[PDB]
Amino acid sequence: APQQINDIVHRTITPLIEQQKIPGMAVAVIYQGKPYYFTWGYADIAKKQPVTQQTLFELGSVSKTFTGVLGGDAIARGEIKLSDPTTKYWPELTAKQWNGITLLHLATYTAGGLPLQVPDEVKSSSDLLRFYQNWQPAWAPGTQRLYANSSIGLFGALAVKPSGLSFEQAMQTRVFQPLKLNHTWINVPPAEEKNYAWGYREGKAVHVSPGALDAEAYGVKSTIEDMARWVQSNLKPLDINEKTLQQGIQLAQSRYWQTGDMYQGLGWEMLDWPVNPDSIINGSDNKIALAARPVKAITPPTPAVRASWVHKTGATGGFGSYVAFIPEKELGIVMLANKNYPNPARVDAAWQILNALQ
Ligand SMILES: *C(=O)[C@@H](NC(=O)c1c(-c2ccccc2)noc1C)[C@@H]1N[C@@H](C(=O)O)C(C)(C)S1
Numbered sequence: 403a404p405q406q407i408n409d410i411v412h413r414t415i416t417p418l419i420e421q422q423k424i425p426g427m428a429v430a431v432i433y434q435g436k437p438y439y440f441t442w443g444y445a446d447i448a449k450k451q452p453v454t455q456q457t458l459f460e461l462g463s464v465s466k467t468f469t470g471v472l473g474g475d476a477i478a479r480g481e482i483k484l485s486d487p488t489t490k491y492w493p494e495l496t497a498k499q500w501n502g503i504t505l506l507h508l509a510t511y512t513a514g515g516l517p518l519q520v521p522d523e524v525k526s527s528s529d530l531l532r533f534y535q536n537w538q539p540a541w542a543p544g545t546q547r548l549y550a551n552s553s554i555g556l557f558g559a560l561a562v563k564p565s566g567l568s569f570e571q572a573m574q575t576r577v578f579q580p581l582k583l584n585h586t587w588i589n590v591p592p593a594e595e596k597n598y599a600w601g602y603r604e605g606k607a608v609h610v611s612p613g614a615l616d617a618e619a620y621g622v623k624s625t626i627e628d629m630a631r632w633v634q635s636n637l638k639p640l641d642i643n644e645k646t647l648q649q650g651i652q653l654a655q656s657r658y659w660q661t662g663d664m665y666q667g668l669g670w671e672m673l674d675w676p677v678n679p680d681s682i683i684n685g686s687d688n689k690i691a692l693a694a695r696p697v698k699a700i701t702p703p704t705p706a707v708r709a710s711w712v713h714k715t716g717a718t719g720g721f722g723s724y725v726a727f728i729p730e731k732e733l734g735i736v737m738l739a740n741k742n743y744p745n746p747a748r749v750d751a752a753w754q755i756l757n758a759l760q
Pocket residue numbers: 461462463464549551610619620688691692715716717718719742745
């Protein structure tokens with residue numbers, strides 16, 4: 403790294419680790435397009451295994467960025483349209499409240515109040531159908547945003563149906579492989595288990611539990627190198643050789659809805675750059691992140707704006723992640739930690755680094 407990058411990163415992240423008691427962390431900065439890596443602490447505290455550039459972390463809800471791009475790619479292939487009713491792709495979904503709810507609504511949390519989590523009691527396919535059939539919207543579609551794993555997760559499952567591929571197979575063949583993300587996984591293979599960090603929640607080593615629509619909402623695991631490659635791809639989609647994938651990246655960074663200073667993409671969320679750091683820092687707090695917020699439709703959606711702060715936070719019980727990038731500046735960061743610590747501390751650290759380098 404240039405010494406400048408080294409210093410800004412270390413003088414930001416070292417205190418963050420100390421204050422939040424994070425056991426292990428990995429950071430990548432993308433600066434003028436090139437990645438620089440940094441690692442601290444432990445992947446496995448009991449086995450004294452350090453964090454390396456090969457360590458897998460649970461991305462949690464950052465997974466949604468992959469789901470949003472995979473959907474984008476399906477739209478670009480002509481397999482699905484965001485304007486399609488949900489019922490086109492799940493004809494068993496006959497309940498009247500679904501009339502008017504499109505794939506766009508599912509993808510952008512605007513279906514009318516689908517809940518944050520799919521209930522833990524949903525264990526099978528018929529349980530899932532029952533859940534969505536019996537869900538009662540609080541709101542008309544396209545009026546309020548309520549962040550929901552059950553919303554984007556269903557989008558993900560539906561989006562891959564016409565391909566005939568499972569979500570995991572579609573993701574591997576259409577996103578991970580073409581982008582050379584060869585250490586990024588929905589299900590960690592045995593060959594990579596020795597690199598799979600433990601997450602830490604109240605001092606206990608934990609991994610994410612199986613759950614309905616986990617793959618689509620929160621189930622990706624990846625290394626700091628692959629995630630830097632993911633930032634590079636989203637920074638410069640027009641360099642990707644796969645046509646539909648290049649377009650799906652763009653579509654995921656299109657602005658569909660606005661609530662305050664924030665625009666909703668497919669998975670990604672965006673703000674105009676330059677950004678007021680109090681907008682993003684405080685906005686990342688979960689009482690704000692997860693609130694019911696009225697949205698304004700952006701009619702038609704604005705294509706990916708290069709002058710944007712594009713970002714996503716994620717957590718599992720044992721991990722905390724953050725990704726942000728600024729396409730106009732060829733600049734981005736990935737922060738992966740094996741403790742779930744507050745979003746505002748992530749975003750503050752990220753902005754401190756990127757603002758210094760900008
Ligand atoms: C994605 O990261 C989602 N995470 C979870 O639903 C989740 C949690 C959790 C942590 C904190 C509060 C509620 C749930 N534990 O295990 C899982 C699988 C959602 N996105 C996050 C984000 O940062 O956008 C949250 C914290 C808003 S929940």
